[PDB]
């Protein structure tokens, strides 16, 4: 299973680096070893990175997060986003935070303030594991990847 879940709504659109297409994460549950876009925090550049496994974490409460440019995602309270002061849980974010977005359309990260965080409802939620960089782009937002438990029990 997962050591810890940072799950997001199944409707979240995952940018697939190989094909340049976006696919809802719920539709990736039976897929593995495909490439996503992830931030390398050491270089602040986006890199292609391989997903090892997709997980369905069950029904959970989700919250809609919105940034100024209009980026939006539905995620659990435990999903993590990258702020100027490091990774934070969705339920730790406030309107004073900026979150990291991949640049769209010089740097690779654009920092955008949060304008809304709202409880939305209960949905099936999903996680990706991304060994190494441990993050991926969903709905054009950087989100942290979950951590799989060691096969022996971890």
Numbering used by the authors: -6 to -1, 1 to 99, 115 to 163
Paper quotes:
Strikingly, the functional complementation of the catalytic His73 through a large (–1) side chain also extended to a single H73A mutant of the M86 intein. Here, splicing activity was restored, whereas the same intein with the native Gly(–1) was completely inactive. Again, this hypothesis was confirmed by the crystal structure of the G(–1)F/H73A mutant, which revealed that significant changes are indeed restricted to the N-terminal splice junction. The effects are even more pronounced in the M86(G(–1)F/H73A) mutant. Here, the dihedral angle φ of the Ala1 residue is twisted to –76°, which represents a marked change of up to 91° relative to the other M86 structures. The resulting twist rotates the carbonyl of the scissile peptide bond toward the space liberated by the missing His73 side chain. The new space has also accommodated a water molecule (water 5), which is not present in the other two structures. This water molecule seems to stabilize the twisted conformation by coordinating the carbonyl oxygens of Phe(–1) and of the block G His153. The overall distortion of the plane with the scissile peptide bond, described by the angle ω, increases from the M86 intein (ω = 179°) to the G(–1)F mutant (ω = –173°) and the G(–1)F/H73A double mutant (ω = –159°). In particular the latter structure, with 21° off from the optimal trans-conformation, suggests that the mutations have a significant effect on the stability of the peptide bond.
